[PDB]
Amino acid sequence: MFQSILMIVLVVMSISLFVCFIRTLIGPTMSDRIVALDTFGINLIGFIGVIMMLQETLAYSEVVLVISILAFIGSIALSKFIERGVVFDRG
Amino acid sequence: MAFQILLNLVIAVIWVNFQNSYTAVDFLIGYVVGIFILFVLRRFLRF
Amino acid sequence: MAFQILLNLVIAVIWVNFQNSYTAVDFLIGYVVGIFILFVLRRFLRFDFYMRRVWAIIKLIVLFFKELILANIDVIKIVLSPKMNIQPGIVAVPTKLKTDWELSLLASLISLTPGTLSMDFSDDNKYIYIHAIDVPNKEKMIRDIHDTFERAILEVTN
Amino acid sequence: MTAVEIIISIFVLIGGFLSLLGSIGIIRFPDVYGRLHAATKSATLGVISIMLATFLFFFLVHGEFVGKLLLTILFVFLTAPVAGMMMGRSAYRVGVPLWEKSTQDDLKKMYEK
Amino acid sequence: MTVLHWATISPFLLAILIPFLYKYARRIHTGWFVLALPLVLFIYFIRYLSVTSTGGVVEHTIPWVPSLGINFTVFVDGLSLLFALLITGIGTLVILYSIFYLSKKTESLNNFYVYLLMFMGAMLGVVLSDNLIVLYVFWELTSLASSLLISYWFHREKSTYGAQKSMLITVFGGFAMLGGFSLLYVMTGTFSIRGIIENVDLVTSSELFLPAMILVLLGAFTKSAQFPFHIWLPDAMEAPTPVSAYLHSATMVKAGIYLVARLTPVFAGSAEWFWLLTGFGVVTLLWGSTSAVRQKDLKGILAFSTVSQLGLIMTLLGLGSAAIYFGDSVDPAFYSFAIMAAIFHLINHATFKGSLFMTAGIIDHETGTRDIRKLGGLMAIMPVTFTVSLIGLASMAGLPPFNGFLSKEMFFTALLRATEMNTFNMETFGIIIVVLAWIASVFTFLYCLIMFFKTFTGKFKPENYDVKVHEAPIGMLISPVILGSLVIVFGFFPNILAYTIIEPAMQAILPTLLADGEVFYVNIYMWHGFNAELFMTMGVVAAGIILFLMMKNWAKTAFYMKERDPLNWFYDNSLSGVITGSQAVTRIQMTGLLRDYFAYMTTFMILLLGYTMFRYDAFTIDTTNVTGIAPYIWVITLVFIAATLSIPFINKRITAVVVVGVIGFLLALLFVVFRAPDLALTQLLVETVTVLLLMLAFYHLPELRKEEFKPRFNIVNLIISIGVGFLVTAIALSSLALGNEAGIEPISQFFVENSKELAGGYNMVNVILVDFRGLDTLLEVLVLGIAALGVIALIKLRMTGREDV
Amino acid sequence: MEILMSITVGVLFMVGTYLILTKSLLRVVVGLILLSHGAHLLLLTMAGLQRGAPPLLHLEATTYSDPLPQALILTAIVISFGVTSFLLVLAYRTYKEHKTDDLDQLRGSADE
Amino acid sequence: KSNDVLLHSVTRVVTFIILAFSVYLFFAGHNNPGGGFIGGLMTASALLLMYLGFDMKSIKKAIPFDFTKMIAFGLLLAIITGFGGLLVGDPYLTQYFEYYQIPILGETELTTALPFDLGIYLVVVGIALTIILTIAEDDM
Amino acid sequence: MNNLVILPILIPFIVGTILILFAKNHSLQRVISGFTVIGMLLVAIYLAMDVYQNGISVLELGNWQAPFGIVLVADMFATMMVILASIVGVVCLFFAFQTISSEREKYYFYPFYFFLLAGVNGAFLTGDLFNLFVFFEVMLIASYILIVLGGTKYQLRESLKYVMINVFASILFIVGVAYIYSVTGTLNMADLAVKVGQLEQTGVLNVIAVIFLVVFAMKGGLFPLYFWLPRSYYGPPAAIAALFGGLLTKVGIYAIMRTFTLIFTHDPDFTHMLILILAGLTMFFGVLGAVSQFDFKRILSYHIISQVGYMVMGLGIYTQLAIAGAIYYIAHHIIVKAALFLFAGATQRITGTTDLKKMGGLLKTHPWLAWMFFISAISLAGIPPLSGFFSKFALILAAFLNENYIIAAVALAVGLLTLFSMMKIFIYAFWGEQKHTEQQANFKVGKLLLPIVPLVALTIILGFAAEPIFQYSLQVADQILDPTIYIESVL
């Protein structure tokens, strides 16, 4: 019953990823796409937290922390690309 | 300097749980890890 | 603050030897007396007693969480409304906060609070540009920045 | 269902609902600036609420204080505002317009100079 | 290594010393040092007449590569001795001539004598080898040394054209012959010729008998310039004349005649041997005599002459093979006569033709021309050259009393006996052979009259020639006068050759025909009365003179206008064609277009994996031994598939990077569902650095475009893409199912047991990487390090292409 | 589940193959990145999926998912990262020099 | 031209945390997810975020490592560790571990796998930074 | 122990890495590189003698027994390939010392050279299929940079196609290992040979045999999977084209030999017939490419394709004699084909060009170059008694003994086309009137020819001393045609 609820929430999280993905395709703007991408990655942390309760394991606790770091590095770099056309300044 | 010592203990706070050893071996590894991090970042953080 | 925390740990460190416990809960008893030791001696020394600032911070963390919960209630209303009834815009909001870490705290709190999102800072750092979802109610938002959010930052700040 | 399972349930059902809301918001808000409201706030609280549930689950049911889950909460809080700021300000500079029914744009002036 | 081994390869050893002698003894014409070797090998071989002419043979062997059955075996019998004396006797005389024909001042004597001694040692090696692969080895070195001599004036286009044409026609034949020699081994187990002749029944019973015969005759007929491979011989005349005298008239063009005479005891006795030798012989006889008549350079006439006369010798070997068919149902004398005529004519031919190349060479050397249109009147100016030339041309025409009359009369005898054969369809074709041979004898006589009258008669025209004309120096004259003298000696005293040379060579060629210690009767004489063969000869003389007196008439014809052989068009067009065709076939593959390369490779993979999956019935699926799909995996998988299918429709690069990110994140999510945390981590970190890299590259690259849907191009692409996807899946599903049936315990249960006990870790993946399979990890960081150093080199080093070579 | 993942590999191979048959330099590099993803997902699926715990012995599980393929995939991902880096730089250096990203324009002289 | 007060503030805090987490990932590899590759890429990500957040001239003064020598030294550290067994007459790349006792710390496991995996780690950081920085600074 | 088995991998790997620390010092780079290639050669010769006297030496890395650990297996075939890579490694480096710019020395030329050689030796020696993939990747990435280094426009457009195609073939290798792992649960080549034989090479194990054939056929240069090769080899400097020409395709050919003599041996009516057909098509289409070209270095690049066809022709026939022919052919081709690219280098130094139509008369000016080229070129064409003759003759004789008449005929016809192609280079560049200048006529090339002299000497010696080389090839062929010798060594 607790495991039934975790399954329902994993389905809802899956649908959420589906709905973020639609804007990565359709935009309309590049800014829109990088926002959807940023939200897709944050939602993956949710999905894994719940997989860890269902599988009852802490093997994935490093994965959630890496995703949070990488989704951030991804968004900062794509935001700067869009605005300036360079990821790194000075060079 | 009091700042850097507490940072180092804050690194060791961040560190110690991860291992979950709660032994002298792991805390001493943890306090030293932060010394190395602080040394690497000394110029970045202007320490 | 860093001086006093370090002192307090030194006091507990020694105290646990004296009290023959390298057991955990004793470190707390020890640290607590270090607090009362420092509190009693704060007038004797020159100390802005550190636990006032540690409390200021706990209350700021609570506010970060309270505003985020409210912000989500605002979002739910808007997104589950049959029709988007929003009147958005970008508002320049004055700030007194002078330091970079205070501005960073404020810009982060605004973006976690109801209806608002930090866009940009003026060059002189005297204005925070805010994307607001309802510009009609901007006076409330400007009042909350001034009387709740910057008041709470300055308690941990000064 | 045990009282621990109920508390953890609430947190996971809120977290999963706010995640979906965040995504529905990325669809329904009229421009990238309103969609950043949903991305920055709902996606963020949704994921904070699930990490709490996960944290409370290993603590109250397995007696394990998994402090990496709390460090994940902290990274998400630190990072969410700055990411939304860098995505919204990049959009504004690149010329993505505010929505037509928007009624005030103090930032346009500033970027005039 | 016997002395007889050392003699055989001795000319290769001197060839190594020739460049030093030229360098450090230039005072002396290098030929003086070269002359001693063929002259001592001649005297050496002359000592074996004591054994061969008493029925003996000498055989010695040393192994060379016995694991392939290749042994260096030297074998002296009548046949091989005869060719060793020609090669070393006429060799001696041609070196002597070359000392006076090549001036040591401007000529590369070192190149000349190395190529020439290479040939000489290769030719002895051909005729003294009993192992067919050692004979192949020397046979190809004669083709090589021959083309190097045709090319001696390598700055001239004609020289290089002839050197190529010889090498291609003769090596083509040599490669086919190697296939022939390999079939004999497959029949008999030996490359020894004497041992193949012992097992001759295993040859003639075999289904590989005729292919082996054809392949062998391809080699013989290319090297001996039988029609249609004779076209290389006229183009070899670009050589310096000593070479034409030695290689291309007297020795190397007789290597195919040697090989056919040597393998008559394996192949003869059959209609196909009879007809391949007798027909190709008679056409070559007729084609070369007719072509010679229209040549207008002395060496042109003599080259076509040699073609013709080789066809005459090949026809006699062909007629003579009937001795083997009849065995002792007939007197051995009767059809063995043709084999005696062939041997006698080969000797005669070497004497008159070697002498006529030497006089053509003197005429060129002392008038600057070899053109029968510009010569005339040189009888009184060049009387020794005139006399030797007269003798050679009269012998070649078969006028008495010279050596060539006897041999031409023995030819007409052999031909008339063959008409009596009543086998092999000779009841029908015997007279065609006799008539075609008779016509060829008329044309031979006529090309000899043309060469004689146009060169030496009429009025000497001093203004045709640049230089003032004088006889040659005595040194140059000695070699043609000694050869001219033998023309006369063998004409009057033929029976000097009868039991010393000719009879032993007959026994080598017809070894089963007579009991041991039985000799053939050989008595050669000039007068046999008023028989058919004398009328045939009177015939030839008359017809020849008539056609010569009618030349005013037929010289205006279109036949006489041309001189180049009409088969040359084939050779020439076939070569241009290999190059054109090659280029067409190569262009369709190597289009330069990376899509074509991937489409060829993937199309080939689909057809071959597809065919193998049908042939072994490997399309299969196992739906039982699969794990469950939670409902949330259906949605994740649908996103993963949608994201992946959207990529070909995206036309903005930043969208592409975002959807690649999505795909990257979702593959990390699958790795978590599939219990692979170390993969999820790695996959996420690599995906992040790959997104920074794609954007660092996007500063340099242009934007994506919608590229237009060429219907054919992009539907073929679609069908190939689906076919790769479908086969990767089908083979995935079939591998899963065989894996499940098989139930082999995976080796990785050892890592489960022993990661913590024997390697001290609990993370089995890390333990495998650093401990059980640590070498792979060390090699993988080396891949990264090379890629990083490569990226530096690729960005910082920019060279023009003119810096190094 | 091995069936569904074998089909997903099929789809990465099919799109990745379609992209390498296009004229765009960037699209070819992306096709090559998708084929790598497919091969790596294939190597995991072929070992059997969801067959036990993550391969960490301190979990004291009965069955672990097979660790050997996981170590093969790690190596393959890491190599592939190295090579893709090198290939992206080679691609841009090629574009800069030829001023074209169209592979039709990179054909060169015919019968060179 | 851009006020980055918030990006520069946050980049300073997160960098501390990512580096600490990268060192944990490196040491945890033997018994938990992590190791040289994951640690190295995580550490590279921390230095890249500093380049992203600030600018190349400033961060190159701040963290002035020679990433190319780190490749060569990384590789040699990993090769040399593999000769351990040639001391005890064992095949190349034999790995050894013992549980020693140190008073200060406690029972501790020493392994040749640690220096081996440190060599992997140095190459991985070295190559990530050499590749990304060489491209980003490619003027021509 | 058998730690000697790893020295052919570890010396170049260690020296390669050390030379990155000395990028600035060019003299020290050359001296180290020079001693190192010579000691690789003496290590390789010593390993080959040891294995010849004392049997297969197996090294279990990490001390883990097969099939759990990576094994290296030095058998007689592997140790011959290790010597041949060492010979051409020495010669191509001493020729590079006389020819490459100092600019390439600044950018890691010598470390990439040694990492290529380590990769090639690891590929010959590994007893593990995933370890073969990784050694192929070390070889390939070192070739990716060596082939493009300099970044001329040609090099960038052709190198770009070479890398894309090779990346694709590396993916298909992974696909193959996925499917064979699913069936067998092992990567060890011996353990594979045992398990595949337990399963009788049933069903999809045939399909999997064909995927390995294609993967290794793409790396080997068999038709129709060679498009990456002919244009790419033109771009790098002669010392590198010689080493690539001579050795890199041999790693794919060795893998096809090792895989279809050890693992997939149960249905040669299918698999080895398929290999015979690709052999014959590779000989034929290779040599048409060669005949179509009029550029010295492009003609030689197509001859590589043609000649590898002969090496898989002996595996297709699959007898002791054919296999031993192929093993000798492999030794002859490495030696001759590396010499030929080195002669095209020295011809380009003299004339500035590789285009035959712009050349002529080098025989008059540079006879030592001309006669060394000629001897190598007729060896390639199969003219006796050089190495080329004996090795061709063992293959055709094996083909006739086995009644493979069509492939016997293709191998003879292709020989004649090769002769035609080598005589075109001689007629156009060495014969003729002098098309090069007077300054070019006085360029002295002997310093460039000395490194090539041993390869020329070896084609002569391998011809004359064919009997000991052929007896060694027969023993290799015996060893590998019985999978149970390798199997018992390792398991």
Numbering used by the authors:
A (entry chain F): 1 to 91
B (entry chain e): 1 to 47
C (entry chain E): 1 to 158
D (entry chain G): 1 to 113
E (entry chain A): 1 to 805
F (entry chain C): 1 to 112
G (entry chain B): 5 to 144
H (entry chain D): 1 to 491
Q: Which of the paper's sentences describe this entry?
A:
Multiple resistance and pH adaptation (Mrp) cation/proton antiporters are essential for growth of a variety of halophilic and alkaliphilic bacteria under stress conditions. The CPA3 family comprises the larger Mrp (multiple resistance and pH adaptation) type antiporters which have received much attention because of their evolutionary relationship to redox-driven ion pumps of the complex I superfamily. Group I Mrp antiporters consist of seven proteins (MrpA-MrpG). The stoichiometry of the Mrp type antiporters is unknown but is predicted to be electrogenic with the number of transferred protons exceeding the number of transferred sodium ions.
In this work, we determine the cryoEM structure of the Mrp antiporter from Bacillus pseudofirmus at 2.2 Å resolution. The final 3D reconstruction of the protomer yielded a 2.2-Å map, allowing us to build a model including 1957 amino acid residues, three phospholipids, and 360 water molecules. Most of the 360 modelled water molecules are located on the hydrophilic protein surfaces exposed to the cytoplasm or periplasm as expected, but about 70 water molecules are found in the interior of the trans-membrane region. During model building, we noticed clear alternative side chain positions A and B (called alternate locations or altloc in the pdb) for several residues and conformational variations for short sequence stretches. Furthermore, we observed a pronounced structural rearrangement in a highly conserved sequence stretch close to the N-terminal end of TMH8 (positions 246 to 252), resulting in alternative positions of several residues, including strictly conserved His248MrpA. In MrpA, His248MrpA is located at the junction of three hydrated pathways. In the C-terminal domain of MrpA, we modelled Glu687MrpA in TMH19 with two alternative positions of its side chain. With a probe radius of 1.2 Å we identified a putative sodium-exit tunnel originating above the strictly conserved Phe41MrpB that is separated from Glu687MrpA by the hydrophobic Ile77MrpC and Val686MrpA. Strikingly, the tunnel is blocked by one of the two alternative conformations of Phe41MrpB, suggesting a gating function for this residue.
